[PDB]
Amino acid sequence: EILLSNTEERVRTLTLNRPQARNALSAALRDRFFGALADAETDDDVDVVIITGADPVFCAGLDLKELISPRWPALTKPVIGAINGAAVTGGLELALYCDILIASENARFADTHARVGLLPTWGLSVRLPQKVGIGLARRMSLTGDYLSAADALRAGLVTEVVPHDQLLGAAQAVAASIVGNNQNAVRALLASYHRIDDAQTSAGLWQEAMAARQFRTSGD
Amino acid sequence: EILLSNTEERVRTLTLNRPQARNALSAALRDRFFGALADAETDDDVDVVIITGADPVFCAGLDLKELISPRWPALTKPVIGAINGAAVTGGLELALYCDILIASENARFADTHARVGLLPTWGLSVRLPQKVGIGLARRMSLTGDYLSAADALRAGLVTEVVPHDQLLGAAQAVAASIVGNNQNAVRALLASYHRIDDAQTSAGLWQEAMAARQFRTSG
Amino acid sequence: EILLSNTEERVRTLTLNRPQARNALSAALRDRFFGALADAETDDDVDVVIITGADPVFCAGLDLKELDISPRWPALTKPVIGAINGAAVTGGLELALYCDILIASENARFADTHARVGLLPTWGLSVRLPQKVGIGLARRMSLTGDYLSAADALRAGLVTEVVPHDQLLGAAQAVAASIVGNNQNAVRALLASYHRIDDAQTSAGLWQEAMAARQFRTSGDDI
Amino acid sequence: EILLSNTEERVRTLTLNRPQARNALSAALRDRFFGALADAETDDDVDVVIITGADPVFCAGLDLKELDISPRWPALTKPVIGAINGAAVTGGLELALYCDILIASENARFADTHARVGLLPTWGLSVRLPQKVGIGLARRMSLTGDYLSAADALRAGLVTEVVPHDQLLGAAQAVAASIVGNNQNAVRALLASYHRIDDAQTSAGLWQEAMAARQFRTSGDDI
Amino acid sequence: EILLSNTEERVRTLTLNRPQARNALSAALRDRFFGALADAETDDDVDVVIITGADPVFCAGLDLKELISPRWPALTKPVIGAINGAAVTGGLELALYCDILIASENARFADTHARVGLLPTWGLSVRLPQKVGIGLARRMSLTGDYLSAADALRAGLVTEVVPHDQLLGAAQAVAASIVGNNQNAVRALLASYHRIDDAQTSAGLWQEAMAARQFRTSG
Amino acid sequence: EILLSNTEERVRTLTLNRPQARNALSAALRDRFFGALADAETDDDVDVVIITGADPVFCAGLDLKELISPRWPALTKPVIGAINGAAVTGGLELALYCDILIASENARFADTHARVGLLPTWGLSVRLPQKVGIGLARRMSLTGDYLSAADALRAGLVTEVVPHDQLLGAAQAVAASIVGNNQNAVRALLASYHRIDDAQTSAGLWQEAMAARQFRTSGD
């Protein structure tokens, strides 16, 4: 129940499914999600992964009630994020890991790390400015204010915005187009893109990790 | 006839000219185009280059019938690309090399590498993310779908979209403004831009080349 | 009077104030402005800095009538919001590029005249302009010298927001208020990290910018 | 008693002190050692730190009998001289690699057993070992598990000096004295810069080291 | 006959075998050598590779008579080079690819690229400075002089120098110790070393390749 | 007089010549030296440059009595440093700029920046550890102690050490070997090496510059 999984036309959709807890990532949901991605890489029945959330929220972030190392695994199959509502903090980081984002008109995005007195460890501080721009990333992180779907489209955080009821259809359409191409090339090319990106982001991700340790050390 | 070249008031326009083959880049057309850019760098009558294609396509890519090391030379004179229609795969890569792009309303852009079962070797895997964003580059490369002129503008791939018949006039206008500035500074600054950019892209282009070698090696 | 400073509820606003000279940066105004950024970092009454200009220009660039211009934007851990009220040109475009966060008046516009006057930049334009507006737009800006409108800067990602002229400071103070409302140890530890991550990318470019500027000056000392 | 600390004329010496257990780093000794480095940076009585071990081993590595080992060597601006009195193995080789400056007893020797015991490193061996002994020697060390003698470490550049065993601390304190005699604001501003320059190079490698270690643990959680 | 291959107790030794042409790498010998390394990566009977040459030269470089893209494949199994004599130019580059080197007292090393009017394309301009120091790489490349086995040891190019007749035994000894360790960890660590190294060398190898293209272009 | 210049067999030797001031670099000597290198690049009569000092010192560093931006120009011809005695501080930086070093038994090397309360601006803090190793560079910089010719050979700072009276002969021999090779290739290759090195050292040199400005700012 806490994660749904379904495979149609070689596209597997993973759905975060604790809607009454606004899809917060508990220890259980983290293990199940990150495990489900790893399995999709090795499963010859799947070419593309779509990730989404049960409405009205995509992901509210880590289950802070309950409470952090990075776990997104190495994939050569593409992951499309179908963002159905608020993506906040660690939930925003999940969106940021996706290769391709599409958004409902209901999508919005926020970083509350500075608001709740924490620092990111899942790449926000690298990938946010990479994907929305330096100033917008800094405005988002320091104010903690929401970025709308329309503005996310403008800044290049998502590739498409559609009416709520069309969201999954749109993600499936992009996935069908991928599925219809040569998959040896899809994966070789995507693996190459990840390598080239990783080469630029490693140093920055190391610094994100060190900044978080130092912040935790002095607060303790 | 396959490449047209005209020099006017220190602006040289190179026109890919195989309209019936949608300006597909043959071995002969590669040699004339890349060679023309090299000649342009050292010709003292030239301050600025404009590249374009004979209608209705800018460049369909490599000539796949006939059938790929990089050959765009090191330049300190600016190259404005006037995209008059489809820029596909190899031809998107030509667009990506240009310092500044302006598009007809008819421009559209595509990467069909993964559709036809090849990996890029002219910088697409580096420059496309650089110029349209990671998300969109990945959506383009993996789908093979066209990005419209208007979306190219939004994403920052092109600086201007004008109606089709204003395209060259729009390119010549930008050229005139560059020519009207101090050419010593224009070249020193451009060289510096290239250097700073090259420092960021080198690693990535090497990884692009190795990925292509490994892919060609398995098949 | 060439630089105004005012401090309201942990937000310090620095206003370049030579309106009749378009807020051109004379040596005196540079010493004043850069000195003021330095102080703000050490002042325990300040969490956020806003920089802006006296209408109608934000900043026309260096005082060329008055005129080796080394970089002087100091290491800060507090955010600096640029409220761009009008033209930011050349050095003044560089000041804007240094800001963490920009907000524009519909009156704002942006331009690089380094190639027009035949000089190369030493305050990071060659690195940060492509970084924050895209490569092709940066190259077209620098090489033509033409103005980028507020609408196009928003489209390009150079500013976060365009508002009507009389709302400009209101919009900067609203972002300021939200930052001030958050946990300031976290705000600073994150901004610092953001700055280290960015710096790790820009440093090789800034060195090459500086070497290019030295080489260009030295070959003109042969003309 | 598991860690000795002594402070003499602005030089603090930290001696790993479980000789009969070869100065293996138990959780208690790690908390003690790393805590002590942290304190030294904030202590106004200390300009220079020397780390060494109780004879006959410098440090045998982590307490494996006792046994996710994240990096804990803190950001310091004061120099740390490693006086290597004997074997430094695996984690203990990593502690030595963290030092700014090494001096060895003829008794010192160095080894990486990560591949022998089937573990990957997370304290920077994969980055710093090639950095400070050369690529081929690092690869031969890590892959064979064999010992590198003091003589060969000097030849390779891993240590700055080899002395007779009973001169070891004398030689570390002599370097300490000279550093202490210099301008300490300059000593620290330069060391800090040295650390930023190095860090800009090592950071991408340290991240990749960490990811490799995560991937290796996760595929063994399938065995 | 041109490449010898023997597998023993999970150690494979590849021997360049054109002694009369001083193991010069012909088109055919390149294909067999590079192909052999690729086969080695996927052969489950192999943990460690040793490369060496038939006496008296390790490798004289490319076969210049007959007459250069890089082709050393991505490996996670260690390659020990047993340098039995002269390693020159292309052949120095083979030595530089190896994870670990051991030398006969007869080994010597040279870069004759600038003497014969060529620029390197197999990583010399990156890996030589990396492995002997900047000063010495530059003295080597610009002079064309030999670096002796003993000096190679001092400078860190090789890990061990042994008398000529102990060379292979010295290489097999290191191989045995690697084989005796946990191979999962040995491969994961080696892959990680390669990755970390590749991250530092990519930009440089791209610049190496472009410098070679520009040089070939002017002549 | 303050700089000597002589060209034999297409090898130009530049000799720092204020021996009674231990070849300290005054404003005049800086202009004349850095100008002399720039001229050698453009002078078709020259293939190699050797730099050295009038005995007993190579270079004591900047004329501190008198009192700093970097000025070593872009060269494609090789520069061999013939180090005849002490190379200290800015003088050590000069040695570090050379492509190839050879040393008299009289050579020694020192960094006194921390001793005299200054920070380097001519690349010491990048190139020292590049060429002698991280720990030795740190030992040298923080103690200010001399490194001998023998140890400099060991650490890889110089390529050769010879008796004092043989020093220039040795440099001329290495230069003759260069001169006898194909000069199009010598220069293309050396230009490529400089590009590859510059790519690794730029970020670090920028940080050296920033560290120096910040140190000067706080001391003022």
UniProtKB/TrEMBL annotation, chains A, F:
Signal peptide residue numbers: none
InterPro entries hit by this protein: ClpP/crotonase-like_dom_sf (IPR029045), Enoyl-CoA_hydra/iso (IPR001753)
Stored Pfam families: ECH_1
GO function terms (MF aspect): catalytic activity
Protein family membership: Belongs to the enoyl-CoA hydratase/isomerase family.
Protein name according to UniProt: EchA16_2
Protein's organism: Mycolicibacterium paratuberculosis (strain ATCC BAA-968 / K-10) (Mycobacterium paratuberculosis)
Phylogenetic classification of the source organism: Bacteria, Bacillati, Actinomycetota, Actinomycetes, Mycobacteriales
Gene: echA16
TrEMBL record, chains B, E:
Matching InterPro entries: ClpP/crotonase-like_dom_sf, Enoyl-CoA_hydra/iso
CDD domains: crotonase-like (cd06558)
GO MF annotations in UniProt: catalytic activity
Pfam families recorded: ECH_1 (PF00378)
SUPFAM superfamilies xrefs: ClpP/crotonase
Top-level lineage group: Bacteria
Family: Belongs to the enoyl-CoA hydratase/isomerase family.
The protein's name: EchA16_2
Native source organism of the sequence: Mycolicibacterium paratuberculosis (strain ATCC BAA-968 / K-10) (Mycobacterium paratuberculosis)
Gene giving rise to this polypeptide: echA16
